[PDB]
Amino acid sequence: LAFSPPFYPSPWANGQGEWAEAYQRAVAIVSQMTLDEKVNLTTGTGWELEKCVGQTGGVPRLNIGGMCLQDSPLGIRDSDYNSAFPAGVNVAATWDKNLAYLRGQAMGQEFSDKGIDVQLGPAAGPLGRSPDGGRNWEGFSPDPALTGVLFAETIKGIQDAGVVATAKHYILNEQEHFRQVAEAAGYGFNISDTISSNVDDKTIHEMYLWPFADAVRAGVGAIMCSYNQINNSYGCQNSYTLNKLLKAELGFQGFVMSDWGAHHSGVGSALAGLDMSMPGDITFDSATSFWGTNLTIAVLNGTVPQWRVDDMAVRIMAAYYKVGRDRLYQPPNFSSWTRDEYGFKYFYPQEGPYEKVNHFVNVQRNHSEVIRKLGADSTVLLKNNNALPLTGKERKVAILGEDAGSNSYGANGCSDRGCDNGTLAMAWGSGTAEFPYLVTPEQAIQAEVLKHKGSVYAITDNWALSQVETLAKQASVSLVFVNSDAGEGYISVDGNEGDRNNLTLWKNGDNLIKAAANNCNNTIVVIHSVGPVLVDEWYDHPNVTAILWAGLPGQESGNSLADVLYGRVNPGAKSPFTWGKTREAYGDYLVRELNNGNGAPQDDFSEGVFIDYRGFDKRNETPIYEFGHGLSYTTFNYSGLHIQVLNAVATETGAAPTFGQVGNASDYVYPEGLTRISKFIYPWLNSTDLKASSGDPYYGVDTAEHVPEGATDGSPQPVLPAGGGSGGNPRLYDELIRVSVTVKNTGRVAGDAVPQLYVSLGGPNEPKVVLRKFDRLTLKPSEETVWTTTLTRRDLSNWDVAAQDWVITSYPKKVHVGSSSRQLPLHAALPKVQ
Amino acid sequence: LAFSPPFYPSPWANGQGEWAEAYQRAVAIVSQMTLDEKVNLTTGTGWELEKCVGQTGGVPRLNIGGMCLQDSPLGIRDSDYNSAFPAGVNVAATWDKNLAYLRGQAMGQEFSDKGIDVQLGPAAGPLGRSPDGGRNWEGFSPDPALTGVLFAETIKGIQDAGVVATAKHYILNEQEHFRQVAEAAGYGFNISDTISSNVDDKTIHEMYLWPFADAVRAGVGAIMCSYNQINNSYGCQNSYTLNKLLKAELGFQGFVMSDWGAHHSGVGSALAGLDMSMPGDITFDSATSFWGTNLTIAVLNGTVPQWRVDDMAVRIMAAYYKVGRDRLYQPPNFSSWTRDEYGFKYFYPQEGPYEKVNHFVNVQRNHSEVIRKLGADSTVLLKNNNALPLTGKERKVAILGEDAGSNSYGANGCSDRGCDNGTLAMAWGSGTAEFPYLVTPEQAIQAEVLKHKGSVYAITDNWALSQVETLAKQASVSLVFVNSDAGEGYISVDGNEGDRNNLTLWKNGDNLIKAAANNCNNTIVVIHSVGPVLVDEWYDHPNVTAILWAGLPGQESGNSLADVLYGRVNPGAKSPFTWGKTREAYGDYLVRELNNGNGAPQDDFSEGVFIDYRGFDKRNETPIYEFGHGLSYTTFNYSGLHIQVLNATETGAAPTFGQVGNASDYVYPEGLTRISKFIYPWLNSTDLKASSGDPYYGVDTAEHVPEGATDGSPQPVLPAGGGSGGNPRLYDELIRVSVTVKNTGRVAGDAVPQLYVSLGGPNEPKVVLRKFDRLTLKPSEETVWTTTLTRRDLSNWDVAAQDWVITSYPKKVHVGSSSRQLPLHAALPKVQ
Ligand SMILES: *[C@@H]1O[C@H](CO)[C@@H](O[C@@H]2O[C@H](CO)[C@@H](O[C@@H]3O[C@H](CO[C@H]4O[C@H](CO[C@H]5O[C@H](CO)[C@@H](O)[C@H](O)[C@@H]5O[C@H]5O[C@H](CO)[C@@H](O)[C@H](O)[C@@H]5O)[C@@H](O)[C@H](O[C@H]5O[C@H](CO)[C@@H](O)[C@H](O)[C@@H]5O[C@H]5O[C@H](CO)[C@@H](O)[C@H](O)[C@@H]5O)[C@@H]4O)[C@@H](O)[C@H](O[C@H]4O[C@H](CO)[C@@H](O)[C@H](O)[C@@H]4O[C@H]4O[C@H](CO)[C@@H](O)[C@H](O)[C@@H]4O)[C@@H]3O)[C@H](O)[C@H]2NC(C)=O)[C@H](O)[C@H]1NC(C)=O
Ligand SMILES: *[C@@H]1O[C@H](CO)[C@@H](O[C@@H]2O[C@H](CO)[C@@H](O[C@@H]3O[C@H](CO[C@H]4O[C@H](CO[C@H]5O[C@H](CO)[C@@H](O)[C@H](O)[C@@H]5O[C@H]5O[C@H](CO)[C@@H](O)[C@H](O)[C@@H]5O)[C@@H](O)[C@H](O[C@H]5O[C@H](CO)[C@@H](O)[C@H](O)[C@@H]5O[C@H]5O[C@H](CO)[C@@H](O)[C@H](O)[C@@H]5O)[C@@H]4O)[C@@H](O)[C@H](O[C@H]4O[C@H](CO)[C@@H](O)[C@H](O)[C@@H]4O[C@H]4O[C@H](CO)[C@@H](O)[C@H](O)[C@@H]4O)[C@@H]3O)[C@H](O)[C@H]2NC(C)=O)[C@H](O)[C@H]1NC(C)=O
Ligand SMILES: *[C@@H]1O[C@H](CO)[C@@H](O[C@@H]2O[C@H](CO)[C@@H](O[C@@H]3O[C@H](CO[C@H]4O[C@H](CO)[C@@H](O)[C@H](O)[C@@H]4O)[C@@H](O)[C@H](O[C@H]4O[C@H](CO)[C@@H](O)[C@H](O)[C@@H]4O[C@H]4O[C@H](CO)[C@@H](O)[C@H](O)[C@@H]4O[C@H]4O[C@H](CO)[C@@H](O)[C@H](O)[C@@H]4O)[C@@H]3O)[C@H](O)[C@H]2NC(C)=O)[C@H](O)[C@H]1NC(C)=O
Numbered sequence A: 001l002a003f004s005p006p007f008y009p010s011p012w013a014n015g016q017g018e019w020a021e022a023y024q025r026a027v028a029i030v031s032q033m034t035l036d037e038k039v040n041l042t043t044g045t046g047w048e049l050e051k052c053v054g055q056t057g058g059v060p061r062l063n064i065g066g067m068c069l070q071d072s073p074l075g076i077r078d079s080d081y082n083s084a085f086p087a088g089v090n091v092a093a094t095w096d097k098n099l100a101y102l103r104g105q106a107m108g109q110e111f112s113d114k115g116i117d118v119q120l121g122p123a124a125g126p127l128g129r130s131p132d133g134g135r136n137w138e139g140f141s142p143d144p145a146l147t148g149v150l151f152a153e154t155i156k157g158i159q160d161a162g163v164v165a166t167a168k169h170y171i172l173n174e175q176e177h178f179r180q181v182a183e184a185a186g187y188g189f190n191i192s193d194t195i196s197s198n199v200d201d202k203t204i205h206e207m208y209l210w211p212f213a214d215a216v217r218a219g220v221g222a223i224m225c226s227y228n229q230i231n232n233s234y235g236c237q238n239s240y241t242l243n244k245l246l247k248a249e250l251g252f253q254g255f256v257m258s259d260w261g262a263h264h265s266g267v268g269s270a271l272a273g274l275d276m277s278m279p280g281d282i283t284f285d286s287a288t289s290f291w292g293t294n295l296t297i298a299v300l301n302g303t304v305p306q307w308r309v310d311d312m313a314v315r316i317m318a319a320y321y322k323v324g325r326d327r328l329y330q331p332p333n334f335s336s337w338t339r340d341e342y343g344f345k346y347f348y349p350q351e352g353p354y355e356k357v358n359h360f361v362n363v364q365r366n367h368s369e370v371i372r373k374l375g376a377d378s379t380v381l382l383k384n385n386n387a388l389p390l391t392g393k394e395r396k397v398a399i400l401g402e403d404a405g406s407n408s409y410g411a412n413g414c415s416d417r418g419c420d421n422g423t424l425a426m427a428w429g430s431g432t433a434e435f436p437y438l439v440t441p442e443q444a445i446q447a448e449v450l451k452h453k454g455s456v457y458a459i460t461d462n463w464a465l466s467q468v469e470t471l472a473k474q475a476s477v478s479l480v481f482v483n484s485d486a487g488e489g490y491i492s493v494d495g496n497e498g499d500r501n502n503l504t505l506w507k508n509g510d511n512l513i514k515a516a517a518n519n520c521n522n523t524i525v526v527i528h529s530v531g532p533v534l535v536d537e538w539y540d541h542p543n544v545t546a547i548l549w550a551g552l553p554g555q556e557s558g559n560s561l562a563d564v565l566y567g568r569v570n571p572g573a574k575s576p577f578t579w580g581k582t583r584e585a586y587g588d589y590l591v592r593e594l595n596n597g598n599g600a601p602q603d604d605f606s607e608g609v610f611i612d613y614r615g616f617d618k619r620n621e622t623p624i625y626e627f628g629h630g631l632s633y634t635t636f637n638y639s640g641l642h643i644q645v646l647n648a649v650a651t652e653t654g655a656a657p658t659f660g661q662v663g664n665a666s667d668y669v670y671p672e673g674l675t676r677i678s679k680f681i682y683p684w685l686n687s688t689d690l691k692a693s694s695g696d697p698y699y700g701v702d703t704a705e706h707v708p709e710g711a712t713d714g715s716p717q718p719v720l721p722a723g724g725g726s727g728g729n730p731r732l733y734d735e736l737i738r739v740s741v742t743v744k745n746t747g748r749v750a751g752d753a754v755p756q757l758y759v760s761l762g763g764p765n766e767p768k769v770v771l772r773k774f775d776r777l778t779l780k781p782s783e784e785t786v787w788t789t790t791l792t793r794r795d796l797s798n799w800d801v802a803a804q805d806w807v808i809t810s811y812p813k814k815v816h817v818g819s820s821s822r823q824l825p826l827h828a829a830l831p832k833v834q
Numbered sequence B: 001l002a003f004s005p006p007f008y009p010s011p012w013a014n015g016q017g018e019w020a021e022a023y024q025r026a027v028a029i030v031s032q033m034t035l036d037e038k039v040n041l042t043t044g045t046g047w048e049l050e051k052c053v054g055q056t057g058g059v060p061r062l063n064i065g066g067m068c069l070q071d072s073p074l075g076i077r078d079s080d081y082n083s084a085f086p087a088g089v090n091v092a093a094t095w096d097k098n099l100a101y102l103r104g105q106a107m108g109q110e111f112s113d114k115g116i117d118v119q120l121g122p123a124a125g126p127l128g129r130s131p132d133g134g135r136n137w138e139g140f141s142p143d144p145a146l147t148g149v150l151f152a153e154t155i156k157g158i159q160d161a162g163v164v165a166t167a168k169h170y171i172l173n174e175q176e177h178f179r180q181v182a183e184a185a186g187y188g189f190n191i192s193d194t195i196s197s198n199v200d201d202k203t204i205h206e207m208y209l210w211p212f213a214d215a216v217r218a219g220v221g222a223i224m225c226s227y228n229q230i231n232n233s234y235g236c237q238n239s240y241t242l243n244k245l246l247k248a249e250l251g252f253q254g255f256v257m258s259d260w261g262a263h264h265s266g267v268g269s270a271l272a273g274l275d276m277s278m279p280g281d282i283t284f285d286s287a288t289s290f291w292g293t294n295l296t297i298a299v300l301n302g303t304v305p306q307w308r309v310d311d312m313a314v315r316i317m318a319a320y321y322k323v324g325r326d327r328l329y330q331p332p333n334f335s336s337w338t339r340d341e342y343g344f345k346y347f348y349p350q351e352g353p354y355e356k357v358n359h360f361v362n363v364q365r366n367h368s369e370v371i372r373k374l375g376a377d378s379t380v381l382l383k384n385n386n387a388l389p390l391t392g393k394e395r396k397v398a399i400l401g402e403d404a405g406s407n408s409y410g411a412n413g414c415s416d417r418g419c420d421n422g423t424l425a426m427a428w429g430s431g432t433a434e435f436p437y438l439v440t441p442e443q444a445i446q447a448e449v450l451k452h453k454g455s456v457y458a459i460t461d462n463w464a465l466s467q468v469e470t471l472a473k474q475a476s477v478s479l480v481f482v483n484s485d486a487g488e489g490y491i492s493v494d495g496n497e498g499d500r501n502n503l504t505l506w507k508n509g510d511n512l513i514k515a516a517a518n519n520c521n522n523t524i525v526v527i528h529s530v531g532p533v534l535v536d537e538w539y540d541h542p543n544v545t546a547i548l549w550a551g552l553p554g555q556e557s558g559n560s561l562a563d564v565l566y567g568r569v570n571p572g573a574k575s576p577f578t579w580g581k582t583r584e585a586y587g588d589y590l591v592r593e594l595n596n597g598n599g600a601p602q603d604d605f606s607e608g609v610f611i612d613y614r615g616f617d618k619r620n621e622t623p624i625y626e627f628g629h630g631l632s633y634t635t636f637n638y639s640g641l642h643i644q645v646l647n648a649t650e651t652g653a654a655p656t657f658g659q660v661g662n663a664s665d666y667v668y669p670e671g672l673t674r675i676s677k678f679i680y681p682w683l684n685s686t687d688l689k690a691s692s693g694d695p696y697y698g699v700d701t702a703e704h705v706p707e708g709a710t711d712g713s714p715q716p717v718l719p720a721g722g723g724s725g726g727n728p729r730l731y732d733e734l735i736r737v738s739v740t741v742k743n744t745g746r747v748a749g750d751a752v753p754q755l756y757v758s759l760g761g762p763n764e765p766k767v768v769l770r771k772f773d774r775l776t777l778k779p780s781e782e783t784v785w786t787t788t789l790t791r792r793d794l795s796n797w798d799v800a801a802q803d804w805v806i807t808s809y810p811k812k813v814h815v816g817s818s819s820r821q822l823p824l825h826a827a828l829p830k831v832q
């Protein structure tokens, strides 16, 4: 059984880089705080006790309001008068840094204006190991370089708007099956612990950890650790991922919160590097906590050192000052639990004053513009035989497929989007937001036809094949809509328990396209989905003249598409994952059966780095549409590749500091004038009897055997070779090579090119190409521009497990530039650099 | 059993009134025709043999193309790139003569450009004896004055655009049940002949006939006789309705065509006043005809006088020339039977040249504008507790009801509209047209809200009550859509065989309104339906703040409604029927069970003239919403009633035109390939009997030909005849009535002043509608409305005198805003 080696102590914050001023202020405020106050910062107040999906008590004596933590990565969850943005996989499909930033900023403004302090997103974990993982859509791309840049830009947009961003889920939560014990039980599986991702050190550094290093370096405030185990140690108490990888190596200065229900111990978690417990209780409304009271006590009895709790407090306050949250503070002006204007203050037990719980604040501004633009710029044109753009002069237009029409229960009529009815604009689970409205393809395309006085109908029942065939025959174009859904594991739709059971079109989609293609010589397929689908039985049909994948566009879905279909937007999106011929061609199977008796299922990542296009490439498999593939209504030419070699840190930390003082147990007893709200989690002790007021069956049992070596060691520590900066040693960020290429629009209309830069790092076990750089360039017909990027030392390195460091190996390296991972007409050998 | 007295001979045309020219050109061309050519004019070429729903083979030797006859009364059926107009009943809701005319004109243009010569509409029969009658929606109103005026207006619009209109169905086809023997069989009833409408002479004159008189007087060129019997004589061989009532009394100068399968004899129908057999065969594609060959033989053998067939050919040509069809002629450029560009020229047997059968001509022009406007001006505001118009500033809008959303099979996804799925903008059967598209309420209202940056959703599953209640608690306004559908008898939806089984909202409509109104203090109900529905269990709910009825609005439905809801259009429409508390409150039950063994069911119109509001008023029942009721976004005042008193006896002999030769002249030409199932006018051989194949040929012939049926001698002109739509003295204006109408509200808008008389006497309705108009007034703006009462308007039909008589009982006049809101009244002075 895979094992996770200890790494202690839990590194302490130091004001590194961009964090200096936030840290000074955090120190100055935490210095003034009592122990119970500090504890208050670390622990949620209990499932559905206050307004937000997570919420802490704050420090009322020092005028620090409770921190409000709300889902989701694509807009405010469980609220009203908010926008629904396209999903993160759409962001990835844009290959546009600027759009990722703008979406981050639009979300941040909305979260801010609801009195939300922390957004539970963006996501980069799951990275995308398996094309059927239920949550890949919440993230970006199975590619680390593309994912990391867009993750980082999204984080910066949110944080520049004055809300803490939360990089989640850290780390290796690559599937939904067996991610939680009670969740597996509800599906009839009996497991004593959650699935264990077992991964080698090289793989983790070069893939799953890489976007987290980008997030840390961009200044991310928070990280959320995951439900799964890593080598059979839970994500939210894994000292190797948390103390070693994230805090010592990556030099992470903010706080680590648990996923909801991912907290599995008081002492172990605190010493293994967790900073905040969400939603606060052990299970929802258990009125017990691994922290709160238990953590106050653990400091009082000598088990957790004051410096560790003080560091939790400093990291939490530092994230808060760093984004300027204190300057924007206001209590949450909505409730996640009800839409009622008035209600009891403490939702779950229905206690506290009866008062205004919703203000109905309209936070949307004009954000439908970025959503519409982004949806259009993420529409991948996979196939186009001179079919598109449409002109408006088409005489009779057939809109075919349920995915074009309305959800008959209303756009929000399935709780957490837990169905696949009508057009698919948002997948399911916690990564969701209430739509203010949803513009369907049916509405948008019908309005466009009628504006030109054409004829148009929508058929939206995918088994009405007789009416489909009859209409297809009469039409000048058939626009066929199809989808494939997925989502978080707590919701099952049609027996799909988060993870998709297959990669086939839902609701008869393949039969629908065939019914149409057999009758219109101009059949145009639109796919909405969470990731790749099997297109093998119809993509090469002579009557399927164009194919688009539009992802999950959010609220303006139909207008984003019309913009693309009718040429207002020249599509420039690129596939951010691989379209293979079969499920088998992707390998990386999901663990769907118990393979460790009734223990934790074991998920061995035995492919190593060979996921998505790296795997297709290794196996010599030819994708239908490759990573980086996307067409345009113009043409681009790449020429003139040139390479230019360019001219291009403490060894110990300080001792761990403590701020403020700890007093007697009697100081932290429940205050006499306070009504204790039922299920509410507090930092207080029933009496000075520590053991009895812990109520912990294991209190003082074999304590020292359960505290790992080094776990309480507050003395100076060595700086890891790969650490000592933000997102790693700052040398990794030295720019070693400049690359330049000329890109020309050789066609008849303006459009965006997406130049892509791959390297071959060389060596018997490396992928043949891996993406390193990209940009999205707007070019007029005949226009030329010189695209210039740089490669960093990290970009040219591999993880050396013996050195514990990034090393540029002695194998000769090459650069490749072109339009996709398989369309690389330019190549150049790289000279030795170190 | 009821009995239909004979009336013979069948009156011949005489070029009366506005028909003088058309009749002279008709006589000139028929004079040049051989017998088989004339017969070709009168007989369809067989079911689905050519392009149109009905088609004659024309007279090629004289450059007269075959006549193309096509459904429906609300747009071109079975075609492509055509418009889909609101139903008749919507035109009735507008109370707008000018809109009726513009909708006729728009349709005429579309039909004309497809190469269609004759539109099979408009409809005023059914009048609407029964609220659950399956085709009432095709027509106008159970009121004969409102129907007659709007029916005449539609016909003028169609015919001024150069297409023959066909006033249908003549007469008394007031229910779908048992209207056809084969149809009844498919529903499990064994009857030997169709339902017989049995109606007294006064009622027929004062109600069912009256809009046909207006149609005739406005110049309609064709009439279509009905599937049902009247007093046990088939509508298409009824000498009393056709010969006496239509041709001798109303002076109809045009042609009468059979309904499709309504032809039931060769000699009998011809002599009883029928002019045209549609679709030409005895049963669909039987390759046999009551006419065609049979009618050539009936003339050659002396049973049908030459003058009768000459007259048929003269009526048919006079109609065609009357609308100027000859100047606009082109073969039909689409096929009713396939959408393919190419196909066999004779669809049913798939024979003849393989060639172009569809040219996909887009005839829609700008007709979507008149459609949108008529849909808005026909949306009756039944209740408004200060909820409308919406401002567009409503923060969150719930659209609720499957009636707001799309048909999941596509707007034309159910053949002849034979389903109730998604928004109801068209009822079912032959009275239909392919939408070029359908703007749903969901589309237009959500677009409206998005334009103002509001939040909006549509819920379109009527059993998703949980989702409906959750949204309705969060909404600023809830717009709840519900319907009730019906149609022609050959289609059954949810067990409704044409006729409605009930007047209750379909698709959980009542429970949907109750779930919304239980949670939004601002619930607004929109009804699409073929007629009245029962609103009693929610109309007065304190959270139901408004209620509209929008009828069957055609392709622009959503934009029509949004224009009204958002105040672009001030509703002016008025209910064209009564909204009763219960079904019982209407009486006039359908005949739904066999009541004459396995003979024809007997449908006794035992209520007489007392249908719709006449019956409610008679029984002193209070309607929830009366005939004539509609609210506006402004208010109007009616005052200053002022009343002022104002200051041929035989026909010619029947003519014959041209000559009849020997049998041998009418034998099939030698070089002609005979298309299979095609109906021709020719004889297999000079042997008459063997060429007819009639098992009754030559047997008891004279005993089967009623007295006077072959009398070509000059005939007496009836007292109530002698003109167009009746004796011209009937149209003398006897009294002028005036009132002042003022807009006293804050919104420009239309008033619909309505003038009712009481003719008096123990058997007369308390009030009957006589005149109306729709007048546009700005806020504070006044106008004088002036109108006149004719001799007909003040008369009752006297069965003894066989004439209209102003009876001696004192009469009153009433003016107001509805049949129940009449603040102005006076005694009328005695006039004669
Ligand atoms: C001051 O106040 C404080 C606050 O009140 C007091 O704090 C309490 O102190 C107690 C100790 O005195 C704590 O109780 C003990 O906790 C441990 C740890 O449990 C958690 O972690 C487990 C994994 O642990 C490893 O990793 C963590 C870090 O992630 C480390 O901190 C641990 O040291 C350990 O590290 C090794 O392994 C990692 C790699 O994994 C390496 O990198 C290191 O090098 C080390 O080699 C984890 O498995 C536990 O998970 C269980 O609990 C969850 C419920 O919380 C549940 O979700 C899981 O499914 C799982 O359930 C199973 O186990 C529990 C009991 O733990 C059962 O109830 C349950 O029914 C299941 O069977 C958890 O997240 C825990 O291991 C200890 O229990 C072991 O030992 C006792 C006897 O001492 C046995 O009775 C138990 O059966 C159990 O035995 C297992 O392990 C033995 C190894 O020693 C092995 O010999 C056995 O064979 C067996 O399999 C204690 O439970 C208590 O948590 C804490 N309370 C709070 C609120 O913090 C403090 O005492 C007081 N101070 C003083 C001086 O008074
Ligand atoms: C030159 O060439 C010509 C063209 O080829 C030759 O034309 C043929 O001439 C034949 C006569 O020689 C015609 O055959 C006869 O038809 C008659 C009429 O049938 C039709 O009308 C019936 C109603 O009739 C009344 O009303 C019409 C106008 O609507 C009048 O024209 C009639 O005079 C009659 O008028 C009276 O009543 C009205 C009020 O109703 C008054 O206003 C008047 O004052 C009078 O009182 C109608 O009911 C018939 O309906 C049947 O046919 C439909 C199918 O067509 C069907 O859908 C109906 O259900 C119904 O079906 C039932 O009856 C038929 C038989 O007709 C059966 O096959 C079937 O199975 C059903 O049972 C129809 O529309 C017709 O009545 C004659 O048949 C009767 O008499 C014969 C004896 O001669 C019996 O054998 C029959 O059983 C039948 O008897 C009934 O009536 C008797 C009294 O009349 C009574 O005594 C019996 O007890 C019984 O109940 C003939 O069939 C033929 O139609 C015509 N062909 C064409 C193509 O036009 C012509 O001969 C030739 N000339 C020469 C000189 O050679
Ligand atoms: C009642 O209404 C009905 C329905 O409207 C009328 O029925 C229609 O009447 C038409 C006559 O007016 C008849 O028309 C015929 O159609 C035939 C089919 O035409 C199509 O196929 C051909 C062949 O490949 C194409 O050319 C053509 O464009 C069509 O696609 C034609 O073949 C007939 O053409 C012949 O007659 C016309 C004049 O009518 C001539 O102009 C033409 O040149 C052809 O003339 C030859 O045949 C005639 C036969 O009468 C001879 O008289 C003449 O001398 C020529 O003969 C030479 O060629 C023939 C064979 O081609 C050869 O055997 C001979 O020895 C010589 O070499 C004509 O156009 C419709 O088909 C018919 N419809 C149906 C469904 O039956 C009806 O008339 C009405 N009744 C009344 C009283 O008005």
Ligand SMILES: *[C@@H]1O[C@H](CO)[C@@H](O[C@@H]2O[C@H](CO)[C@@H](O[C@@H]3O[C@H](CO[C@H]4O[C@H](CO)[C@@H](O)[C@H](O)[C@@H]4O)[C@@H](O)[C@H](O)[C@@H]3O)[C@H](O)[C@H]2NC(C)=O)[C@H](O)[C@H]1NC(C)=O
Pocket (backbone or CB within 6 Å): A036, A037, A040, A045, A056, A057, A058, A059, A060, A061, A066, A353, A674, A675, A676, A677, A680, A683
């Ligand atoms: C850790 O977090 C906890 C949650 O934030 C903190 O508990 C809260 O502490 C505040 C400050 O002590 C308490 O506030 C008190 O509230 C009562 C009742 O308030 C309401 O009713 C009155 C009377 O009609 C009304 O006038 C008020 O405006 C309120 O609506 C007041 O009477 C007190 O004077 C005082 O303001 C909260 O009650 C308490 N919350 C809960 C859930 O118990 C706790 O202080 C934090 N601990 C540390 C060490 O910081």
Ligand SMILES: *[C@@H]1O[C@H](CO)[C@@H](O)[C@H](O)[C@H]1NC(C)=O
Pocket (backbone or CB within 6 Å): A686, A692, A693, A694, A695
């Ligand atoms: C603290 O006191 C409360 C209420 O008096 C009690 O119910 C709760 O269980 C106590 N906690 C412990 C750990 O005993």
